[model samples]
Target: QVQLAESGGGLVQAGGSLKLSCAASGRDFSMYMLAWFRQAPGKEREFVAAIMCSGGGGGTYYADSMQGRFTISRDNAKKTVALQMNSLKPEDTAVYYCAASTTYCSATTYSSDRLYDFWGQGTQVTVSS
Candidate 1:
């Protein structure tokens, strides 16, 4: 069974950044795709970013809303992934989750991470001055 143990949470100043990590255990990191999602209070979960790995190739894709302020990175050797959110604000507050999905990227088709296969317990974050 694969598990994404998420860590890193706390208060981030309005102008600072937040970093979160997920350690993947029980599976091959390169055989699957990893993603980040967040849900603000009373709002639906939103896709932040995702890293896809396929046949020694992979790429990270970010949602339009997160393009300039968020980043997703991976350390295959550690079977881990991390998310960085910059220029934090109150609106950036949410319970962030690191998720895993199956890889479907091929020479002709792209991988779709719309559905998550494994999920972290989630890390709650707060942003304030």
Candidate 2:
């Protein structure tokens, strides 16, 4: 019964902000890593950010393109993750997708083979007037 779902998306005014949320259910929210990705209209998907779980790096990372306006965070107590961004523009229209995978860690080393194995259906985002 493991599941992940996303919400908080729709028309956003130019220069506005977005608060997208992802919720995991039917499992221990601390047992995996969560990532965010987005695909601009007719463009390839881009890695937005990721938050490692308790056992892994327990760190958060953002893509260079996000510059300094994107934030990825989690609240395991509520089994939720969030992606926040501001200064929206027309180019920001895209479908934001949430993904999950097991932490890439071993007995004493973090594995480089980290790969997302689960994903949400994605929610569309549009920036307009």
Candidate 3:
């Protein structure tokens, strides 16, 4: 069984940086893909970043909108994953989630477009003056 939980959420100042992390336990990290998403109040969740870990190594994919503002990384030894966002703004304030899927992606292929099977409790962040 796999379980996930999120942490590090609070107020952030505009132009500042913040990081939200998720700890995943009870499963091998080398075969699953971990993804992060952001959702605003009353809006749909949007992809933020993803880490595809396989065969002892992996790569990260980021949403176009997150190009240079967000980063995704994982520590297989610690069973933890993190997402960091820089240059914060009010629009960046939202609920963030870390999700997992059995599906995998490779150098030339991508994971299927599907809903996540497991997810961490969301962390809500607020950006203000």
**Per-prediction TM-score, please?**
0.87, 0.85, 0.88
lDDT of 3 by residue, 1-129 (tens): 679999988898999999889999866776777888888899888888888776636688887875589898888888888988899888888899888876554323333335566788899999996
Off by over 4 Å in 1: 54-56, 103-114
Candidate 2 residues lying further than 4 Å off, grouped into runs, are 103-114
Model 1 per-residue lDDT tens digits across residues 10-128? 88889899889999985567778788888888998887888777554667788787547988888888998999888888887889888886544322222233566788999999898
Per TM-score, what order, best first? 3, 1, 2
lDDT value, residue 24 of candidate 1? 92
What are the runs in model 3 whose C-alpha is more than 4 Å off? 105-113
**Pairs with steric clashes in candidate 3:** none
Span of 10 residues, lowest total lDDT, candidate 3: 104-113
By lDDT: ranked, best first: 3, 1, 2
| Overall lDDT per candidate, in order of appearance | 0.79, 0.78, 0.80
User: lDDT by residue for model 2 over 14-99, one digit each (tens)?
Assistant: 89999999988846668787888888878987788888886665688777776778898888889888999788887778999888
